[PDB]
Enzyme design. Structure first.
Site, PDB file in Angstrom:
ATOM      1  N   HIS A  61       0.804  -1.220   0.000  1.00  0.00           N
ATOM      2  CA  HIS A  61       0.000   0.000   0.000  1.00  0.00           C
ATOM      3  C   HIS A  61       0.838   1.272   0.000  1.00  0.00           C
ATOM      4  CE1 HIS A  61       0.736   0.646   4.362  1.00  0.00           C
ATOM      5  NE2 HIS A  61       0.748  -0.675   4.395  1.00  0.00           N
ATOM      6  N   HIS A  64       8.119   2.212   2.915  1.00  0.00           N
ATOM      7  CA  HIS A  64       8.617   2.639   4.211  1.00  0.00           C
ATOM      8  C   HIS A  64      10.129   2.767   4.162  1.00  0.00           C
ATOM      9  CE1 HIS A  64       4.897   0.820   6.467  1.00  0.00           C
ATOM     10  NE2 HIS A  64       4.615   1.938   5.821  1.00  0.00           N
ATOM     11  N   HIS A  91       7.635   7.793   5.968  1.00  0.00           N
ATOM     12  CA  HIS A  91       6.919   7.367   4.771  1.00  0.00           C
ATOM     13  C   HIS A  91       6.017   8.511   4.336  1.00  0.00           C
ATOM     14  CE1 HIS A  91       4.047   6.131   8.009  1.00  0.00           C
ATOM     15  NE2 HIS A  91       3.256   6.814   7.198  1.00  0.00           N
ATOM     16  N   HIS A  93       2.112   9.685   2.295  1.00  0.00           N
ATOM     17  CA  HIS A  93       0.807   9.395   1.733  1.00  0.00           C
ATOM     18  C   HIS A  93       0.576  10.328   0.555  1.00  0.00           C
ATOM     19  CE1 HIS A  93      -0.575   7.033   5.346  1.00  0.00           C
ATOM     20  NE2 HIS A  93       0.411   7.741   5.865  1.00  0.00           N
ATOM     21  N   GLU A 103      -3.229  13.540   4.344  1.00  0.00           N
ATOM     22  CA  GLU A 103      -4.175  12.938   5.279  1.00  0.00           C
ATOM     23  C   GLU A 103      -4.807  14.024   6.143  1.00  0.00           C
ATOM     24  OE1 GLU A 103      -3.741   8.522   5.556  1.00  0.00           O
ATOM     25  OE2 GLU A 103      -2.149   9.232   6.913  1.00  0.00           O
ATOM     26  N   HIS A 116       5.278  11.554   6.892  1.00  0.00           N
ATOM     27  CA  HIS A 116       5.134  11.119   8.283  1.00  0.00           C
ATOM     28  C   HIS A 116       6.479  10.624   8.783  1.00  0.00           C
ATOM     29  CE1 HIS A 116       0.523  10.411   7.881  1.00  0.00           C
ATOM     30  NE2 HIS A 116       0.833  11.672   8.128  1.00  0.00           N
ATOM     31  N   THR A 196      -2.989   6.100  11.147  1.00  0.00           N
ATOM     32  CA  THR A 196      -4.006   6.415  10.150  1.00  0.00           C
ATOM     33  C   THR A 196      -4.379   5.230   9.275  1.00  0.00           C
ATOM     34  OG1 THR A 196      -2.460   7.182   8.443  1.00  0.00           O
ATOM     35  CG2 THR A 196      -3.209   8.806  10.087  1.00  0.00           C
ATOM     36  N   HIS A 197      -3.868   4.034   9.554  1.00  0.00           N
ATOM     37  CA  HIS A 197      -4.344   2.834   8.886  1.00  0.00           C
ATOM     38  C   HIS A 197      -4.248   1.682   9.870  1.00  0.00           C
ATOM     39  CE1 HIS A 197      -0.250   1.282   8.296  1.00  0.00           C
ATOM     40  NE2 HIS A 197       0.097   2.429   7.741  1.00  0.00           N
TER      41      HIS A 197
END
Ligand SMILES: NS(=O)(=O)c1cccc(NC(=O)NCCNCc2ccccc2)c1
Ligand SMILES: [Zn+2]
Length: 257
Positions: A61, A64, A91, A93, A103, A116, A196-197
């Site tokens: 997804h 990292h 990482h 998003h 996010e 992040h 957040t996941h």
């Protein structure tokens, strides 16, 4: 197997992870008219050792960049914290187009991507695995990324992606200080939140920078050219991996400024 598409994505996560509907979920929309300035907040202090950079990994997804976290060579201090937090990963998003991808949002504005930088509380806990579920276990700096000029500080990261194109591929990623990616001003918002996941643990103290950093449309395209499939299978680009913003549920976003 959670993901980001419509069958396994954010709006379905609660079936497998009920905490998705919790009281301390992230990300959030930061409404600046409702933030509360806190004179007790100290400046953020980051001191990272480039030798702790270890590996870059395609996790399906996202990707990292992981750091050696056996000692306090790379630490975050200050802000709302009394304890030292040990760097373990950064990482990004992003979204399907430039119009979204961050996010967190600020006054409803969506940015193109978000960085992040994640740390765990080595004062109170002995490992990431122990700290990951503790309310004071994790600290994550979020930097909003605004589409515009190419960001040369992203170069080593972008150059590494060709070696981890498909899910599960890993490669050494060494001699890198990710504080070089942070904005010049470290004025920040902070609030208690969550990963957040999945597993969405409400273990994260968020540090959201007021200042954005840049990224170009083509640099974002490199993110989206990463593949979520394993080598040999049909190519499935990583088009997006940002979670929608979640309700504050009475939390207060504090400002350092
Ligand atoms: N987007 S984030 O909220 O800033 C955030 C911050 C830190 C970590 C993650 N996610 C991952 O590291 N996933 C890969 C390994 N999963 C195991 C695990 C479980 C709990 C905590 C760390 C690691 C997401
Ligand atoms: Zn993240």
């Amino acid at each position: 197997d959670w993901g980001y598409d419509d069958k396994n994505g954010p709006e379905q996560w609660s079936k497998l992870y009920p905490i998705a509907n919790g009281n301390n979920q992230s990300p959030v929309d930061i409404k600046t008219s409702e933030t509360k300035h806190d004179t007790s907040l100290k400046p953020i202090s980051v001191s990272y050792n480039p030798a702790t950079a270890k590996e870059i990994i395609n996790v399906g997804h996202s990707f990292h960049v992981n750091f050696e976290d056996n000692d306090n060579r790379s630490v975050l201090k200050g802000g709302p914290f009394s304890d030292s937090y040990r760097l373990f990963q950064f990482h990004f998003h992003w979204g399907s187009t430039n119009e979204h991808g961050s996010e967190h949002t600020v006054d409803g504005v969506k940015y193109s991507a978000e960085l992040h930088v994640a740390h765990w509380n080595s004062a109170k806990y002995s490992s990431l695995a122990e700290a990951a579920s503790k309310a004071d276990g994790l600290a994550v700096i979020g930097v909003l990324m605004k589409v515009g000029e190419a960001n040369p500080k992203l170069q080593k990261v972008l150059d590494a992606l060709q070696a981890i194109k498909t899910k599960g591929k890993r490669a050494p990623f060494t001699n890198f200080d990710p504080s070089t990616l942070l904005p010049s001003s470290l004025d920040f918002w902070t609030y208690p939140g969550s990963l957040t996941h999945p597993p969405l643990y409400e273990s994260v103290t968020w540090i959201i920078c007021k200042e954005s950093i840049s990224v170009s449309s083509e640099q974002l395209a490199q993110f989206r050219s990463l593949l979520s499939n394993v080598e040999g299978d049909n190519a499935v680009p990583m088009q997006h991996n940002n979670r929608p913003t979640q309700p504050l549920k009475g939390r207060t976003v504090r400002a350092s400024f």
